[PDB]
């Protein structure tokens, strides 16, 4: 699938390790993670998953 990056580790864009409620748990590091993946083709898959809450 489509890979995204978090500092030194690789993960699938649709599945960040912070799930569920990435922004609610830690807003600063969620935005930093999104900023590091803007050039990545699977950015919008990461944006969708990171800004989704309610488990």
Partner 1 sequence: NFNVYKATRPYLAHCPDCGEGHSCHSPVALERIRNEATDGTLKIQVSLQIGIKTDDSHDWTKLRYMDNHMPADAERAGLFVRTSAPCTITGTMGHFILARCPKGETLTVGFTDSRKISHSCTHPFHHDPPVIGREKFHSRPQHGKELPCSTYVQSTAATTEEIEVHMPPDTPDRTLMSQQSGNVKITVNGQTVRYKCNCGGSNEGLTTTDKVINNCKVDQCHAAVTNHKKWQYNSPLVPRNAELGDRKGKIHIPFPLANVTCRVPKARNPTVTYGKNQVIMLLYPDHPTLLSYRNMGEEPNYQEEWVMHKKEVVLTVPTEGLEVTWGNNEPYKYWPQL
Residue 10: enclosing H or E segment and its boundaries?
strand 9-12
Quickly tell me which residue has 């990545």 as its tokens: 40
Q: Where on the chain is the footprint of partner 1 (CB under 8 A)? A: 23-24, 27-28, 30-32, 34-35, 38, 43-44, 47-48, 51-54
Minimum Å gap between C-beta 5 and partner 1 is 14
The tokens for 50 are: 């990171």
d(CA 40, CA 27): 21
């Amino acid at each position: 699938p489509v890979m995204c990056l978090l500092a030194n580790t690789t993960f699938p864009c649709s599945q960040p390790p912070c799930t569920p409620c990435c922004y609610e748990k830690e807003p600063e590091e969620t935005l930093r993670m999104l900023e590091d993946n803007v050039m990545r083709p699977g950015y919008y898959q990461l944006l969708q998953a990171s800004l989704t809450c309610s488990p």
